[PDB]
Amino acid sequence: MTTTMKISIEFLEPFRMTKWQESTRRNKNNKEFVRGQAFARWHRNKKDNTKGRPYITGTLLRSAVIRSAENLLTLSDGKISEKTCCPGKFDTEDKDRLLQLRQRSTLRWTDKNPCPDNAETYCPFCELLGRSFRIHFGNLSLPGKPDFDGPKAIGSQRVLNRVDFKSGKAHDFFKAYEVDHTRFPRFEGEITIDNKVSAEARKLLCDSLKFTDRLCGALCVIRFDNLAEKTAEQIISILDDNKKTEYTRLLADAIRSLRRSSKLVAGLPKDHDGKDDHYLWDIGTIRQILTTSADTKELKNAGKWREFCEKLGEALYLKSKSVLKETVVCGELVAKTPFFFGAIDEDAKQTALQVLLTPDNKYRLPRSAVRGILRRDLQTYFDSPCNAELGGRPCMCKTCRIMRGITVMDARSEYNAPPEIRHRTRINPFTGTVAEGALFNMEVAPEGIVFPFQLRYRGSEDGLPDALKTVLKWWAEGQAFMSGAASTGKGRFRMENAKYETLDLSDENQRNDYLKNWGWRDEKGLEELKKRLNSGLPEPGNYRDPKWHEINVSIEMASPFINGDPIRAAVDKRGTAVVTFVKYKAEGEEAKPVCAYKAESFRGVIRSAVARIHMEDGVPLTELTHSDCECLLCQIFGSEYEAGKIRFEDLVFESDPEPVTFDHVAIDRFTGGAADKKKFDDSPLPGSPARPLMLKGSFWIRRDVLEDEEYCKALGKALADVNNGLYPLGGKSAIGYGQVKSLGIKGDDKRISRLMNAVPEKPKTDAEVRIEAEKVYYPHYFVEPHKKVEREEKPCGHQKFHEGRLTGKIRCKLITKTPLIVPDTSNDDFFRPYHKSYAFFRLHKQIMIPGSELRGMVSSVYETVTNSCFRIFDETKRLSWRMDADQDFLPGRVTADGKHIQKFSETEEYEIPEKARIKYKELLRVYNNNPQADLVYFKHNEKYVEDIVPVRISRTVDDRMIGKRMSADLRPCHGGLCPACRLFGTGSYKGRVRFGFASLENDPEWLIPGKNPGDPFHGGPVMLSLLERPRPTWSIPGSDNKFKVPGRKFYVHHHAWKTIKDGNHPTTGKAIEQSPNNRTVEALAGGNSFSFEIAFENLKEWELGLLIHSLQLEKGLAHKLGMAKSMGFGSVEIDVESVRLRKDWKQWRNGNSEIPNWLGKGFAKLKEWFRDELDFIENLKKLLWFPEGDQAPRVCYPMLRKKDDPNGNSGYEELKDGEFKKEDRQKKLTTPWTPWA
RNA sequence: UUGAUGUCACGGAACCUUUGUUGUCUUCGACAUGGGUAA
Ligand SMILES: [Zn+2]
Ligand SMILES: [Zn+2]
Ligand SMILES: [Zn+2]
Ligand SMILES: [Zn+2]
């Protein structure tokens, strides 16, 4: 009868399945069909659509139970007392008809001859298998006969590889369908019986079923008995209405990043002023839509929220386009590093690579990866690469012999959360900028997750084997690099709390109980095993060292550190443009922000450092296509056709720092004020010499590489180069961030660390100016550049140090003459417990100057001393001019569209052009939005209209833009390059100089004593005047084309800080009254020393001389630096103290005596380009000339009305004649030190 | 819908290769007004 055993196969792993195939190709010839003879199959009731159920064939169960019977009869006794068994009568009538044949070898427990053909009850194994369609039948299927859309709907497809042991690159791969058991746990089937077999037959069937470990290709317990497309349309319609489609991908990334929880939408970043006009979240608005969607009653589940956000991001991205023993070893796999497993899918096109997430949004540890890693470890221990191929016969090598009885169980995590995302970019060596389209990201799991693990080895020897003992010892030590991206650094599992128990041998009592109780492989079975397991681990019988030696690193940084993360900047509470990289761990269902440095960035820096120094055959080794070759760099690091030998790891900080906000502003080189654009800000981590950041971490090296000679020589050379401060870490190195002091190496056994470890007087001035004792001098004057430039030579690359080039470091000292100010611009109420108050810069209670300000100060001097393009300039500004009553405007009206305007007689039509509309549009732009706050009139020549104005007299509008004034040569070079852009760099071309922060050498000084003479750590307040906007309209008198931009703007040096110190106006002599616009700040007394360093790379002989000349200038001339330079606050002079170069990785040289050759040869290059041009060089020296003794100039800004300041000051009302004219403003400001009075 | 006297798929790691890097001194002085005049 039908012994209907509804054998619920409670899988502990996702069982596998095959894609459906039509009956036409259902034959032995089909490769996919013959391959998929051991997995499940998808039955389709109707072929029009993919509706159906999964089915299971009973032949697979028959094969599995027959194999179990083979093993059990081999193990237990060899022969039963009641009846004697045989090895098994196996024969084929025809080989072709059989789809597959047992190509392995059976067991030989008995040598008794094959049974007679003509017999009925002659041995148990034969009478079970047949030869006497009446025993098994059987088809397992889903419970209740459900219906589903299809195999893709109920599960998913995953792809498996075959990695060669030697190279590492996979050769061939295949796909299969996997289905989880969390919602499909049970299966229902039946097994028949003739009611003829003996009791031992049923006993063999039952205990063989209990003994089976893997069925349907998975370890298991064989237990017998809308409203999103509309949202996407709304967002894309808002973007189309507001245009600016370039931000679609950025918005997609930002809105996909909000899948953590619904609480982050409320705390989205705000405007700089705290308003609600963010440039992305208020483009419409989108913020209101997000808030009211988050407040919806249905979208309260975290799962619903995250999947809705994912759907929105995905749709928006697409729119944008014999003695036998057993062992029960267990343990816990604590993850000490992020891990990644390839589960690439097609739905999430935004992210190329995705981790293997379970259907319940939890992480998975597939058995394939574990088995592959075990294969790698055992093969590299035995030193016998298994060169077997698919099919044939199972090779009898030691590795396969050991692995023919190894099983490992799948595991699942518990930290259910959306995985974080990590970016990656490529760098072009010849330009130092990201390549086109080299922007991609991969999704990575968090760190600090526990995975249960259980190993069941069914051996045939006494105890565990020595190879497996050594492998487990290595794993417990923490040498188990399991997950992928091991070259990057991801994946490192340490077996914690190892606790094993060698179960037994092929006995008849404890083995019988083990068989009786299902082998304790279920959850409760695992519990009552763990209650009796014994701690410890067996010792190795013959220990072998691992092939991966650990190296420690201790990097010390003495400056702020920054690592970019643009996507994370769109969700932080503060609206900062650039923020440091942050990683999240798993601290018990918590995500603490942990600051770290990207292992990818560190690996890239090391790779570039080792690449730049070596020389293969005269080529730089960077421009080589590589591909297939045997370079040293390829051999060490790896290429597309070979795995690497070095693995890096993330570096963390040995402190608890918190970010500090800095922000910069660009300055136009002609107006002297802010250039608008965007006040970009950054939040670099804090770091100072007093409390330097201690970066600590460790990377791994292969033992063969360490033992090799040339490889360790290359590594030592690269480490020495990094230690010499030539490859700063992090980003924004051109400002001063990411400077490195030292790099110690330990644990290398003294194999790599062994390789690594009269200033000429300045010249005298020659300029001469005549300062009067009564004349009043204007604050700022203009310097005119040359007509043309020398934008001819091609810039040098960054592939390798070429012959005749120079590289090193420069030390200098800065001493202030006049009072210096560097406001914080962070806290507005420091002195004031409305009015604004600021103090001097402070990082760690150690006052210093930022390096970017010095960068700008010296870059301006270089750009003016050698003619070059205006690097920062605004070329979109229309200038109006309020005209006077000297004109011939005619009346008219604008009502008839198409017919344009018409004339009037009292107090036959003219067409209007389209350009005239633009002038009217901008005319009513600050007419209403003034700071100090349809009948029309038109013009004509014969049929055109020149200008259109509302009122009888108003401001004439300029036709050509401001940018079309100066010559084409001086216009900015956005992308051969002018000499200034060659050195400091460009948006496309990286620079070749680096600056750094300043620091003190003596105790501080202050202009005024503090509120209480308690300590010198703080200064006192001083009242400033009113700082007011510049206006180019004064420099450009009118609309005539003859007027053009004169050049650059500079402030002369004078002594007016005395007047500001006490309550006297710089001009009218009155006291400064309290008001919301006035300013109060701190001040340092003149005479404070400072010190800072400059680095350089790949400089010509003449270029280096110019930079030193452009930096120090010469005694008697000083730069200008600080706040409120109009009133003469802050003058600094740079004095060189040491110049160092480098000749080789081992040898450095103090080239202190060679500077006269460079300085002398610097002017030689000037004669080559410009022969007789010296006025613009001489004019610069006149502007920066310092007031010597008893030559105090009088500098002030005159006011409007002469009646004001009755001392005799002439105001601007009557200054527009005699002294200044309409046609003399440009030339009057040409000569420096020209008194207006 | 499994078709019987043979399935080591417990015969296979989405594995390999790429620095969110570059370019910006928290800087700062001149007017604003529409008519007046006017048949
Ligand atoms: Zn037999
Ligand atoms: Zn083998
Ligand atoms: Zn190569
Ligand atoms: Zn240029």
Numbering used by the authors: 1 to 132, 146 to 238, 260 to 318, 328 to 364, 399 to 834, 843 to 918, 930 to 982, 988 to 1008, ...
What does the literature reporting this entry say, word for word?
The Cas11 domain is positioned at the crescent’s midpoint, and interacts with Cas7.2 and Cas7.3.
However, the resulting complex did not reveal target RNA and exhibited no marked conformational changes to other structures.
